[PDB]
């Protein structure tokens, strides 16, 4: 129910200004804030204190403190995030990079 109330609440703020934003964009935001069975804020004490990739979490507002915790706990990062591939200068697994391209030898050799 709080998820519905949160949506009904933020909708008022945006609607009050006279601007209109689609249902999806507001719906996604409240859903992310309540996947943990609770209102996870977007502050350093909210979203940041999550289990997401350690390297991605460092860059938001707390960096040196975060690295120590990851280093002390021997945290392993899977590099499945966006920032990780940005830091390491690789193609992020998003958009055009969410898949892979293979050479079809069977079709290529077939097409003579």
């Amino acid at each position: 129910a709080g998820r519905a109330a949160l949506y009904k609440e933020v909708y008022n703020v945006i609607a009050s200004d006279g601007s209109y934003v689609n249902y999806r964009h507001m719906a996604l935001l409240v859903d992310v804030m309540t996947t943990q069975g609770g209102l996870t804020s977007v502050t350093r004490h909210g979203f940041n204190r999550s289990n997401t990739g350690a390297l991605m979490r460092c860059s938001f507002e707390e960096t040196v403190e975060i690295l120590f915790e990851a280093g002390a706990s021997a945290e392993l990062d899977d590099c499945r995030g966006v920032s990780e591939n940005v830091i390491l200068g690789q193609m992020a697994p998003i958009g055009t990079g969410a898949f892979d391209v293979m050479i079809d030898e069977e079709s290529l050799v077939k097409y003579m």
Binding site: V21, N22, C58, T63, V64, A72, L76
Partner: protein, 539 residues
């Protein structure tokens, strides 16, 4: 050379002191960074990153260009506390049996049994700390929950545990019957913690052990991390870290000196604190307590933490967002006679930005003409790259009329018409404010945009500026021309509405034009019809 791979995962951890000793290529012993031009082998020696023109870099050659640094080594006379782990160190000692090597609690208590069942390592010991911190005794015999009359002889020490309080860079243990905890004793007890106890505490036996939280040997960052300095006329003006490392070296040398000779016990105690203080601030010069390190010039010393913390650090200021090349910035003006996806680019700007087109049978004839023109005329190139990478400069050679192109070569072609490019208005608030435009070269010094495309940018011709970014590869070109192309963002997902339209005088002009009272003579009509580029020639 070696196989090429891409990083799949990152594993964090702490250096094992033996690992630090092994990785290093030189032992640092002298605070001196210099005599006249030679460099002392005890610091910044050739075994680290050599200075330019010196292809040594511990036999890596390559100068500073293609050779990274190689780490040094320092062996502290007395171990010191790592600053970042002070809080965790306090937490850990609050749970270990304090010179018995075990945990204060044990599986025989139901409360912690649930804590041990917690899958999250970070939350695991947090729950444990809430329990063991309150236990002030590690009695050998603990009654069993299943059998109250039966006790388990676990606690080797069986004595009480002091209340541990943080005081500056040191911890004080108030025994319930009061002294400063000794750094050495922490290593002993931590070394006595069983591997099984690591897991309950969230550590990793091969990447993070409690004893490694105490520094016994300092890794020495190589010169590139603290680049050799030439701000002034042969004046060193070296980086702060070099000065700070020398300061620690001075302290470290003194500490062993006092202990080795004379042994003025009390003087050794303060000497250790100075070593602890200098090392502590060297990594983080921002602590809760008063102590703030000040450079000889009078400004605070910029520890490593400052180089990373906050904006302008290595992460936000140099990794997430960074200075880029192949870009231009100038003022914008309107042009009704310019299509949406098109944009006017100054010849001067177009004459400097380049694109490395590959020589192929389809364009070897055309590219040759551009080379013949040279970098002076607009439709030309600046550099020609051979197969081996010999970056020919057309500016400083008459060979522009002599060079012969070969398939596989790259030509730094000038930006020409219809080349996809990316605009950007600061701030880039939302998606519509970064779109890919086609190029038309305009003979003036300002970007020319269509009017109807100003709305998505939130732009205005009152003196605004736009940044221009040019892709350097065919694949990047395709995505700009297939994803960021202006016509593809006509409908904005923001509000389901077309983010663009007819605005300003054109919007007002149509209203007058389409009134029921407006009529057009024959002479006027013919001119209007011709202005339509898609007209079929039928009146």
């Amino acid at each position: 050379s070696a196989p090429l791979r891409t990083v799949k995962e990152v594993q964090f951890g702490l250096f094992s002191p033996e690992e630090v000793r092994a990785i290093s290529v030189a032992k640092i012993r002298f605070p001196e960074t210099m005599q006249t031009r030679a460099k002392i082998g005890g610091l910044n020696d050739p075994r680290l990153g050599s200075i330019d023109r010196n292809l040594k870099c511990q036999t890596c050659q390559e100068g500073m260009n293609e050779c990274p640094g190689h780490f040094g080594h320092i062996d502290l006379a007395k171990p010191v506390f790592h600053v970042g782990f002070i809080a965790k160190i306090k937490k850990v000692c609050e749970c270990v049996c304090m010179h018995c090597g075990k945990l204060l609690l044990d599986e025989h208590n139901e409360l912690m049994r649930q804590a041990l069942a917690i899958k999250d390592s970070k939350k695991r010991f947090a729950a444990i700390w809430t329990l063991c911190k309150t236990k002030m005794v590690c009695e050998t015999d603990v009654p069993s929950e299943d059998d109250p009359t039966q006790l388990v002889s676990r606690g080797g020490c069986g004595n009480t545990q002091p209340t541990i309080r943080k005081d500056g860079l040191k911890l004080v243990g108030s025994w319930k019957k009061l002294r400063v905890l000794s750094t050495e004793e922490i290593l002993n007890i931590f070394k006595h913690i069983s591997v099984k106890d690591f897991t309950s505490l969230g550590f990793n036996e091969v990447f993070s052990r409690p004893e490694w939280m105490i520094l016994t040997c300092l890794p020495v960052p190589p010169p590139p991390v603290r680049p050799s300095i030439s701000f002034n006329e042969s004046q060193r003006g070296e980086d702060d870290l070099t000065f700070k490392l020398a300061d620690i070296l001075k302290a470290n040398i003194s500490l062993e000196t006092l202990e080795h000779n004379g042994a003025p016990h009390h003087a050794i105690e303060e000497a250790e604190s100075l070593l602890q203080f200098h090392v502590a601030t060297y990594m983080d010069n921002d602590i809760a307590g008063q102590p703030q390190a000040l450079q000889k010039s009078g400004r605070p010393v910029k520890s490593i933490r400052a180089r990373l913390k906050g904006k302008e650090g290595r992460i936000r200021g140099n990794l997430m967002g960074k200075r880029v090349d192949f870009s231009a910035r100038t003022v914008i003006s309107g042009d009704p006679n310019l299509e949406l996806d098109q944009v006017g680019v100054p010849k001067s700007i177009a004459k400097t930005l380049t694109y490395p087109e590959v020589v192929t049978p389809y364009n070897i004839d055309r590219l040759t003409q551009l080379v013949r023109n040279g970098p002076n005329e607009h439709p030309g190139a600046k550099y020609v790259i051979r197969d081996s990478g010999d970056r020919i400069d057309l500016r400083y050679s008459k060979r522009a009329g002599d060079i012969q192109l070969q398939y596989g070569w790259k030509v730094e072609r000038h930006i020409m018409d219809n080349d996809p490019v990316l605009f950007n208005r600061q701030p880039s608030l939302h998606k519509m404010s970064m779109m890919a435009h086609r190029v038309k070269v305009i003979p003036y010094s300002t970007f020319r945009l269509n009017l109807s495309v100003t709305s998505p940018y939130n732009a205005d011709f009152d003196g605004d500026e736009m940044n221009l970014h040019v892709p350097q590869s065919e694949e990047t070109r395709a995505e700009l021309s297939q994803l960021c192309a202006v016509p593809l963002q006509i409908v904005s997902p923001q509000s389901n509405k077309p983010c663009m339209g007819i605005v300003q005088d054109t919007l007002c002009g149509i209203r007058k034009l389409t009134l029921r009272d407006t009529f057009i003579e024959l002479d006027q009509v013919l001119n209007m019809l011709y202005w339509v580029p898609d007209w079929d020639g039928v009146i």
